[PDB]
Ligand binder design. Structure first.
Ligand code: ATP
Ligand code: ADP
Ligand code: 0TF
Ligand code: MG
Ligand code: MG
Length: 344
């Protein structure tokens, strides 16, 4: 049995914990927040700030198989970079790739440098997209791009520095706030796969990255990369393709990775609002919760409950095809109806 240490216990931390458990690993969580969202989901919880007390994390490294940063606190990531040679196990992160991916303008310069199409900068006609809002005087540093209509599509890539494993396409379902409330799998797209390969190869990526593109009216446009363990999509990747991104990332830092199921999966967040009206919500709502863990499971159905000001449910449905998965979704909703008096 292997043991993984997660630095960060919110949304990324949940995803990494969830897949670590699927792989049969013990999950050790480090988080500075004593009320960290997934404190009760992890197998062990150590409450400290890694920047203030590095020796405690270094000591943990002696007794786990890997340390995975799962936060986007720049102070934390940059400090971890500065002490990474002192660790007694792999640190499953690409610090140079993160320095590029975190900065949207630097990412766009990177895309252009390798000929990857991306939305036009500072356009002259509306609509504009600004970063998240559509516009029909902001800080001098705001990204202004053309608004590209169409499907938002995600691909994860795991690299070992030499080989780049492009995994599974997913559809990012967006709400009125441009947050993601649902994820479903998509058929292979040879163009998007090659672009994602090249984005990883040219870094060169040793670690994990996701690539998001919009399938626009004038073709595919890459909108961002994020070189950190994602939320939401890895669960859909797991059921639809059989690949566990935690296992693949761990392999990239041990024996290496090789290039290249066909099930369906529906993943979504639902809030139980005023007098049990069921409302779709984005990730951002879930991150304001106080406690997050497993609520229910049967064949083809997992439900997680995120407690707080109005309970939020994360629903995971799978099956051999769209039809069987739709059937499980209906069953999962009725589990909420008969139990709680929920409407949808
Ligand atoms: N130096 C650190 N040591 C330990 N845990 C940390 C550190 N920095 C961040 N974290 C934890 O990682 C989790 C995710 O942090 P992140 O900054 O990515 O998300 P956030 O939504 O901006 O959270 P916050 O409310 O802290 O701003 C949080 O639970 C946070 O407490
Ligand atoms: N240029 C664009 N044109 C149209 N929609 C966009 C554009 N950029 C972003 N979006 C929309 O805004 C959402 C969030 O943008 P994203 O670049 O993915 O930010 P983040 O780094 O915050 O996740 C996207 O999922 C997409 O729905
Ligand atoms: N592959 C497409 C994924 C986009 C979105 N699902 C995401 O990963 N968001 C991560 C937000 C995490 C915020 C914060 N660092 C936290 O961990 O809570
Ligand atoms: Mg994005
Ligand atoms: Mg992003």
């Amino acid at each position: 049995m292997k043991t993984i240490c997660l630095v960060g216990g919110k949304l990324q931390g949940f995803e990494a914990a969830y897949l670590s458990k699927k792989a049969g690993m013990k999950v050790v969580l480090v988080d500075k927040n004593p009320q960290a969202l997934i404190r009760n989901y992890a197998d062990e919880f150590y409450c400290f700030d890694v920047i203030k007390e590095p020796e405690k994390l270094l000591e943990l490294s002696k007794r786990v198989d890997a340390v995975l940063p799962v936060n986007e606190n720049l102070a934390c990531i940059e400090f971890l970079n500065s002490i990474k040679e002192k660790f007694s196990c792999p640190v499953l992160f690409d610090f140079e790739a993160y320095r590029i991916s975190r900065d949207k303008k630097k990412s766009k310069d990177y895309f252009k440098s390798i000929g990857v199409p991306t939305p036009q900068d500072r356009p002259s006609k509306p609509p504009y997209f600004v970063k998240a809002r559509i516009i029909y005087g902001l800080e001098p540093d705001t990204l202004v791009e053309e608004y590209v209509e169409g499907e938002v599509v995600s691909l994860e890539v795991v690299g070992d520095g030499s080989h780049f494993a492009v995994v599974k396409e997913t559809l990012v379902h967006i709400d009125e706030t441009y947050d993601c409330h649902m994820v479903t799998p998509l058929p292979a797209n040879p163009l998007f796969r090659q672009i994602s390969h090249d984005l990883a190869a040219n870094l060169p990526l040793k670690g994990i990255m996701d690539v998001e593109a919009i399938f626009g009216p004038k073709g595919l446009r890459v909108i961002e990369i994020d070189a950190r363990f994602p939320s939401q999509t890895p669960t859909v990747v797991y059921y639809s393709s059989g690949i566990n991104l935690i296992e693949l990332l761990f392999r990239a830092f041990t024996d290496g990775v090789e290039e290249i199921e066909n099930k369906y999966c529906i993943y979504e967040h639902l809030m139980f609002g005023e007098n049990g009206v069921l409302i779709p919500v984005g990730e951002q709502v879930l991150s304001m919760g106080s406690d997050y863990g497993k609520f229910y499971e049967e064949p083809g159905i997992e439900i997680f409950l995120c407690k707080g000001e109005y309970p939020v449910f994360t629903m995971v449905f799978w099956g051999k095809d769209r039809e069987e998965t739709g059937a499980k979704r209906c069953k999962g909703l009725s589990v909420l109806k008969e139990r709680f008096g929920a409407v949808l």
